[PDB]
């Protein structure tokens, strides 16, 4: 099966992905996102951030307090399974990770932790 997922966007800022399955037998799992803009990481800054749904407004509350120089992520935030760079116009970002953090049945959440951006950059992942 299928261990990567690009995600890409529109001049408007709509992404085109707001679910993504992670086949269990995939050992790594790679996410490539691309900047769709015109502005830079300070005005329109975007990453891919991966947590349980349950810790998601943690990490995006805290993300925010942290500010632009943390990439809008708390340091040593252990809720984050994975996650890109911040990136900004005209720049890309991979991360890939390891599965075995996963578990089958618990409820993912991807999602940009740039302010005000998550309500709507944000997605379902689940392994299966
Ligand atoms: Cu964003
Ligand atoms: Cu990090």
């Not at 690009?6 to 790679?30: L, P």
């Not at 990439?71 to 900004?88: C, F, N, Q, W």
């Not at 075995?100 to 309500?119: D, N, R, V």
């Amino acid at each position: 099966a299928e261990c990567s997922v690009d995600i890409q966007g529109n001049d408007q800022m709509q992404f085109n992905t707001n679910a993504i399955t992670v086949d269990k037998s995939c050992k790594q799992f790679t996410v490539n996102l691309s900047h769709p803009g015109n502005l830079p990481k300070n005005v329109m800054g975007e990453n891919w951030v991966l947590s349980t749904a349950a810790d998601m407004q943690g990490v995006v509350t805290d993300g925010m307090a942290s500010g632009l120089d943390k990439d809008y992520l708390k340091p040593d935030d252990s809720r984050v399974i994975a996650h890109t760079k911040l990136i900004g116009s005209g720049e890309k970002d991979s991360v890939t990770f390891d599965v075995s953090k996963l578990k089958e049945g618990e409820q993912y959440m991807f999602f940009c932790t740039f302010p005000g951006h998550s309500a709507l950059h944000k997605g379902t992942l689940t392994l299966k």
